[PDB]
C-alpha cells in the first residue's frame, strides 16, 4: 500500500486563492493519475479534477489540478474563492491493487454574509382536519448563520407543548433551511383566534400569524 | 453515457446479511470493472471492492462483490452486519474515458424499531400568495431509519425544479423529521389541477396530493 496525505483543514476569505496539497508517501506521484472530489455536507461527492488536471464540464475554471514531482505531490488550486466552495475535498489515485483516497481537507469559507430567514406559516389543511389531526408548519429558509430559535403563540399566549424544530441544513443555494411544526387537535386549532410562529435569527425576530378560515 | 442506479437506502439488524444493487442503464455490466466505495459520514471514502469482486487487503471477507449479467447489475453483499458498517456505499464503472458513479445507498444498521413517516402536504398560505409566491410543503415526521427520498409531481409529470429537501433531523422522540418544499409562482400553482409529494421509505412509496381553490 501507499498513502495520500492532505492537510486537515484550510480557511480563507472569499475572493482569495486556496491551495490543497496531496503528497504520496511512497512511489512517485506521477506513476498514476490523480482525481479530486468535492463534497458539500448533505450531498454526494462530485468530480472536480480527473487525470491530474482535466476539468469535467460544469466545473468552474476557478478549479485547477497540478502535479509537482519534486515535492511528490498533487495540488488542487481554487482561485476566486466563493461561498459555494465550502466543502470537503478528497484526492484519489491507484495502487494498481487498489483505489486510494486522501484523508480529506475541510475548506472553510470565512466571512459568509448574514442572510435573514424567509418565514412562511401554513395552517392545517381541510384534508388533515378531516382525518382528525391538525399540524401547523413554519418554513424557515435562506438564512445564514445556520442557527434560529422559534417560539409559538396561541392567540397572544406562549405554546410550550407539541413543538418540534428540525436542525438547520444547508440547501442548494448554500444557505440554511429548517421547519418548526406544531401538532394540535382540530379542537385546539378551532378554539383559538390565531396561532403565530416567531423566528429569531441573529437578534432580529420575524413573526407570522394564521387563523382558522371562513368560506 | 450510461447510469448506475442504486437504491437510495437499505437496512437490517446486526448480524444479518444485506444486499446493495447497482444496475447499468445501457451497455453490458461485464464490459467494464465495477468498484464499490464505503463512506462513513464526515470521513474519507475507502474502497471495499475493486474489479467486480476483488477485496483490498484489510477489508473483511463479510464484504463480497458480484455481477449478475441477466439483470445487468453489480451487487455488494455484506454479511454479519456490524454497527460500523453503517455508511453510504457507491458503485462505480466506466465506458471509455467516461467514469460513472452510482447515486449512493445509505445502509442503516437498525438501532431501534422501524417507524413509517407521517406525511402532511400543505398548499400555499394566503399571505404568500398576496406576495407573488406559492410554496408547497411536504412535512415528513416520526420516521426511522432517518433516510427518505422525496419526489414531486405536477399533475402526473415529475417536477425537479424548485425542490429543496432538508437533511433528516433526530427530534425529541428519537425519530427523524424533515421537510421538502417546492417553490412555485402563483400562476404555476394555478396552471395545474394538482400537485403530489411522494415519499419513499423502507420499501413503500406513500403519496399526498393537494389542489388549488378559493374559499
Ligand atoms: C469521493 C468519491 N466518491 C465515493 C465516496 C464518490 C461518490 C459518488 C460520486 C458521484 C455521484 C459523482 C462523481 O463524480 O464522483 C463521486 C465520487
Question: How far, in Å, from the CA of B35 to the mean position of ligand 1?
Answer: 11
Asked if residue B150 lies in contact with residue B168, where contact means CB atoms within 8 angstroms, the answer is no
Q: Give contacts of A103 with chain B, Cβ < 8 Å.
A: 44
Nearest CA in chain B to A135: B120
Q: Among A44, A141, A210, select the one facing B125 at the smallest CB separation.
A: A210
Distance from chain centroid for Cα A39 = 10
* Bridge partners, residue B159, by sequence: B152
Grid coordinates 417560539 are at which residue?
A151
Give the DSSP H or E segment for A130: helix A126-130
Q: To 5 degrees, how large is the angle CA A142–CA A46–CA A49? A: 125
Q: Do B6 and B104 form a contact (C-beta atoms < 8 A)?
A: yes
A161 reaches B (C-beta below 8 A): no
Find out whether B103 and B5 touch, Cβ atoms under 8 Å.
Answer: yes
Angstrom distance (rounded) from CA B208 to CA B215: 21
- Which chain A residues are closer than 8 Å to B135 by Cβ? 120, 139
Q: Which CATH number fits domain B112-212: 2.60.40.420, 1.20.120.140, 3.20.20.60, 2.60.40.10?
A: 2.60.40.10
Compute CA distances A174 → A64, B124, B147, whole Å. 22, 24, 21
DSSP labels for B39-92? E-TTS--EEEEBTTTBPPTTS-TTEEEEEETTTTEEEEEE-S--GGG-EEEEEE
CB-based contact B139 A181, cutoff 8 Å: yes
* Segment (H or E) for B187: helix B186-190
* Nearest ligand 1 atom, CA A56: 14
C-beta atoms of A213 and B215 within 8 A: yes
- CB crowding B115-132: b at 16 or more within 10 Å, else e: bebbbbbbbbbeebbeee
Question: Which residue CA neighbors atom 6 of ligand 1 most closely?
Answer: A45
Chain A residues with beta carbon closer than 8 angstroms to that of B56: 97-98
Residues contacting B189, CB < 8 A, separation 6+: B124, B134, B136, B195, B212
| Beta carbon of B90 within 6 Å of any ligand 1 atom | yes
- CATH number for the domain whose boundaries are A112-215: 2.60.40.10
Tally of helices (H runs) and strands (E runs) in chain A: 2, 19
B74 neighbors A133 (Cβ within 8 angstroms): no
Q: Where are the domains of chain A?
A: 1-111, 112-215
- Which residue out of A179, A195, A197, A213 would a mutagenesis test of the B interface target, given it has the greatest number of B Cβ atoms within 10 Å? A179
Question: How many Å apart are CA A5 and CA B214, to the nearest integer?
Answer: 62
Q: Are A177 and A171 in contact (CB under 8 A)?
A: yes
Instruction: Mark residue B131 as left, alpha or beta (left: phi above 0; alpha: psi -120 to 50; beta: remaining).
Output: alpha
**Cβ atoms within 10 Å of A72's Cβ, excluding its own:** 16
List the single residue in A with minimal CA-CA distance to B8: A44
**How far apart, in Å, are the Cα atoms of A132 and each of A73, A128, A137, B118?**
64, 7, 17, 14
Atom 13 of ligand 1, nearest CA residue: A46
A111 min Cα distance to partner chain B (Å): 23
> Which residues fall within 8 angstroms of residue B134, CB to CB, at 6 or more apart?
B124, B128, B184, B185, B186, B188, B189
Residues B7-33 as b/e (b if ≥16 CB within 10 A, e otherwise) read bebbbbeeeeebebbbbbeeeebeebb
Closest CA to B92 of B20, B25, B32, B28: B32
For the domain with range B1-111, which CATH number is right: 2.60.40.10, 1.10.630.10, 3.40.50.2300, 3.40.50.720? 2.60.40.10
Instruction: Give me B50's grid cell.
Output: 475493486
Spatial distance between the Cα atoms of A123 and A116, rounded to a whole number of angstroms: 23
Amino acid at each position: 500500500n501507499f498513502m495520500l496525505n492532505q492537510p486537515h483543514s484550510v480557511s480563507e476569505s472569499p475572493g482569495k486563492t486556496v491551495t490543497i496539497s496531496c503528497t504520496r508517501s511512497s512511489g512517485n506521484i506521477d506513476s498514476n493519475y490523480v482525481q479530486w472530489y468535492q463534497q458539500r455536507p448533505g450531498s454526494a461527492p462530485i468530480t472536480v479534477i480527473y487525470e491530474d488536471n482535466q476539468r469535467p464540464s460544469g466545473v468552474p475554471d476557478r478549479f485547477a489540478g497540478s502535479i509537482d514531482r519534486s515535492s511528490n505531490s498533487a495540488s488542487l488550486t481554487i482561485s476566486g474563492l466563493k461561498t459555494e466552495d465550502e466543502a470537503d475535498y478528497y484526492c484519489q489515485s491507484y495502487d494498481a491493487r487498489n483505489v486510494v483516497f486522501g484523508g480529506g481537507t475541510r475548506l472553510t469559507v470565512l466571512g459568509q454574509p448574514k442572510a435573514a430567514p424567509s418565514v412562511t406559516l401554513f395552517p392545517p389543511s381541510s384534508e388533515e382536519l378531516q382525518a382528525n389531526k391538525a399540524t401547523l408548519v413554519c418554513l424557515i429558509s435562506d438564512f445564514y448563520p445556520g442557527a434560529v430559535t422559534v417560539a409559538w403563540k396561541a392567540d397572544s399566549s406562549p405554546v410550550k407543548a407539541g413543538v418540534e424544530t428540525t436542525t438547520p441544513s444547508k440547501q442548494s443555494n448554500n444557505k440554511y433551511a429548517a421547519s418548526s411544526y406544531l401538532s394540535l387537535t382540530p379542537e385546539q386549532w378551532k378554539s383559538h383566534k390565531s396561532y403565530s410562529c416567531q423566528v429569531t435569527h441573529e437578534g432580529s425576530t420575524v413573526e407570522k400569524t394564521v387563523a382558522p378560515t371562513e368560506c
